[PDB]
Design a protein around this ligand. Structure first.
Ligand SMILES: O=S1(=O)N=C(Nc2ccccc2N2CCCC2)c2c(F)cccc21
Lengths: 255, 300
């Protein structure tokens, strides 16, 4: 087994080094000569490729940066001059300055924190790892890694009865109700009586058919007291550990 | 006969010409030297395809960089990998990722090595270092969960260039924590059993009232796809880092959270005891005029 893999390794090294691409022992001295014809600067490119991050060394006290890698421009669309010559407190979300003070406070101790940085007002979430190196400075790489409510539909969560236990803001545009008006009440209360039974049937089925998505339509009573036709597609959500029925997840869509 | 002494000296020269410390390179195996040279210059090929102060980038990293091939060959691992995984760079470079990862994740790894180009997953890799720094042997290795984030590349044929970060155990933490971070304890179904006092000044919840409540009722539903997966991963790997989600605040609105869940075990019966979550509050209360759940409406 050893001989075959050794020969395959020599062949790989020959197929890899193209300047004798066929003797044997000379391949090794050739490989050393082709290796001496060449690993430091490319680690930054590897970090930028995998993690989409940039290095920066920042003064621990004043927050003024003392160095910033060029990769700040790929990451945050920000010129190197915009970062060099300023403090991190200016390059971060205002509500994020306090945390920064706790992270920049003071020692080769590590540092790991998340913060919203300004990019080229638009803020982006940046995960910063690094360590404290006296120069006191913090040398750290920071990397980059739905919000629909803040409108044809809105999603809601219900208990088994139908009581709104959660509603996203889109309701205020679809049915016209404030979330407080729907929460705490059963969905059948907002149904035209001629449809109520049908609705209830679905709520008995989505529980009886656990994990399957059913869809029923009914005339929702809107804030303007209109009978707005609506297609609710709902399913039962289950706790991945104990399979515990957690709530019925409905998606009420104006139709 | 003398060719052997010439062969040993050229192997020694090859080991020394690899960018490595002179000690570990000088004292190495011949097949290992072959592996390392092949992997180094194949990684150089990939790096020329990509590009077309080392201690700073390496130590300012809560993880190690690994480029694996489409076949699963780990053609390069950053030098600091040992610091996190115990296994040194020399011990793993050139070998298959499948030979040092949990088999139950292999398919997932297999699914991520193929072929959008962004990849973000969790994998259980072999580790021989402990929380004391004492490195042990492969016969007694433990599974360490690594969050791998990176990109797949068609270098001329594929390469998963990922950054793999461990998820720190809540009991052993050498990194400081800010006032915007709080702890929580959960049963294995993610129901609250304990949470910090900081949640009061951060999210408004009294730490006692959250007890026994399912955490599935306290996050904005628009993040469920993440949460579920996280929980599932937390149940299949013992560790996970959530994405950035919204936890509904006390009196309306939500706060942005990223939490690292780790399943812990009672050491006397070795059964899953509970899940410890280190929750990083990423913002103030947003949309505090918009209540979403009954827990906010009942709270006036
Ligand atoms: O907003 S929460 O009530 N939902 C949480 N977690 C949660 C809920 C449902 C499914 C998965 C999770 N996970 C997030 C990553 C680990 C598991 C949670 C928390 F882990 C800590 C504090 C507050 C909250």
């Amino acid at each position: 087994r050893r001989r075959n893999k050794m020969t395959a390794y020599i062949t790989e090294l020959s197929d890899m080094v193209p300047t004798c691409s066929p003797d044997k022992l000379t391949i090794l001295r050739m490989a050393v000569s082709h290796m001496k014809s060449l690993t430091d600067q490319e680690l930054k490119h590897l970090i930028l490729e995998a993690a989409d991050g940039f290095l920066f060394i920042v003064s621990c006290e004043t927050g003024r940066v003392v160095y910033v890698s060029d990769s700040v421009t790929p990451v945050l669309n920000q010129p190197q001059s915009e970062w060099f010559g300023s403090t991190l407190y200016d390059q971060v979300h205002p509500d994020d300055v306090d945390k920064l003070r706790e992270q920049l406070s003071t020692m080769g101790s590590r540092r790991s924190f998340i913060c919203r940085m300004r990019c080229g007002p638009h803020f982006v979430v940046v995960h910063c790892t690094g360590y404290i190196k006296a120069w006191f400075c913090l040398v750290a790489i920071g990397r980059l890694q739905n919000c629909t409510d803040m409108p044809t539909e809105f999603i809601s969560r219900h208990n088994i009865e139908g009581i709104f236990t959660f509603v996203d803001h889109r309701c205020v545009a679809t049915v016209g109700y404030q979330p407080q008006e729907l929460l705490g009440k059963n969905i059948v209360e907002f149904c035209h009586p001629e449809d109520q039974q049908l609705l209830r049937d679905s709520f008995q089925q989505v529980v009886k058919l656990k994990g399957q998505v059913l869809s029923v339509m009914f005339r929702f009573r809107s804030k303007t007291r209109e009978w707005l036709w609506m297609r609710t597609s709902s399913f039962t959500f289950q706790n991945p550990y104990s399979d515990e029925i957690e709530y019925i997840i409905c998606t009420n869509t104006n139709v | 006969r003398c060719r052997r002494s010439k062969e040993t000296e050229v192997f020694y020269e090859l080991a020394h010409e690899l960018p490595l410390p002179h000690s570990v390179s000088s004292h190495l195996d011949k097949a290992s030297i072959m592996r390392l040279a092949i992997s180094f210059l194949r990684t150089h090929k990939l790096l020329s395809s990509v590009c077309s102060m080392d201690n700073l980038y390496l130590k300012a990293l809560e993880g190690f960089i690994a480029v694996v091939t489409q076949d699963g060959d780990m053609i390069f691992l950053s030098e600091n990998i040992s610091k996190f995984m115990g296994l040194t760079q020399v011990e793993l470079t050139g070998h298959s990722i499948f030979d040092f990862t949990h088999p139950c994740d292999h398919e997932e790894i297999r699914e991520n090595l193929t072929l959008s180009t962004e990849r973000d997953f969790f994998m259980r890799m072999k580790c021989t270092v402990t929380n004391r720094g004492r490195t042990v042997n492969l016969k007694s290795a433990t599974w360490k969960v690594l969050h791998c984030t990176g990109q797949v590349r068609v270098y001329n044929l594929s390469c998963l260039i990922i950054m793999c970060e461990p998820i720190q155990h809540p009991s052993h933490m050498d990194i400081p924590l800010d006032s915007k971070t709080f702890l929580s304890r959960h049963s294995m179904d993610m129901k609250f059993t304990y949470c910090d006092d900081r949640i009061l000044e951060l999210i408004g919840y009294h730490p006692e009232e959250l007890l026994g409540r399912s955490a599935y009722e306290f996050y904005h539903a628009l993040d469920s796809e993440n949460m579920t997966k996280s929980h599932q991963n937390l149940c299949t790997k013992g560790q996970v880092v959530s994405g950035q989600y919204r936890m509904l605040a006390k009196h309306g609105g939500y706060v942005w959270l990223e939490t690292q869940g780790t399943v812990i075990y009672n050491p006397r019966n070795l059964q899953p005891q509970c899940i410890m979550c280190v929750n990083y509050v990423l913002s103030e209360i947003e949309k505090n005029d918009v209540v979403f759940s009954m827990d906010q409406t009942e709270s006036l």
